[PDB]
Amino acid sequence: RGPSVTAKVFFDVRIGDKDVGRIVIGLFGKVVPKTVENFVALATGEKGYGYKGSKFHRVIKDFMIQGGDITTGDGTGGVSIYGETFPDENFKLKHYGIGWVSMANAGPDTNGSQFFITLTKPTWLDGKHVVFGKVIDGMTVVHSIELQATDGHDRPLTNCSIINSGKIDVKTPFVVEIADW
């Protein structure tokens, strides 16, 4: 057993001028409903702002790729659908391995729009970052971003852009098995 994927979000990615494919993230709505709602709403852009047009501004091989700065765009910005920030919902899910999706923050209770996809098992972040999703398709796209040349700020030299985002309804929820759940 494990928690159920109840929704999905897609990001179509372009690196410079090349379309590199689509990342599909499955979301654990029953585990972290409030966090999932924020991420889905930002993906669809229904509130009038969202992930479309944002980039993965910080990429560190074998650690994570980070994105979702939907205001300033340099990695210092972002906002949630609930306000500037919202509290940490819970820490039920861990960064179990590669491809788990989690909220970036600026300390306790400062979730906004920015998120990251793991490229390792960062156990030191367990209990500090809210985990809410899992990459179910497009791990090759994540790897393409991961291998991008970056500067000394870990920013890709060429922009890795989310050119479209949205949701895909899940008609049949499915379990992502988790050891010892």
Binding site: R58, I60, F63, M64, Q66, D69, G75, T76, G77, G78, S102, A104, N105, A106, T110, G112, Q114, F116, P122, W124, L125, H129, H153
Partner: peptide, 11 residues
């Protein structure tokens, strides 16, 4: 270090 922050990016 290896953190994921929004504003002050640290070691």
């Amino acid at each position: 270090x290896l953190l994921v922050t929004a504003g002050l990016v640290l070691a």
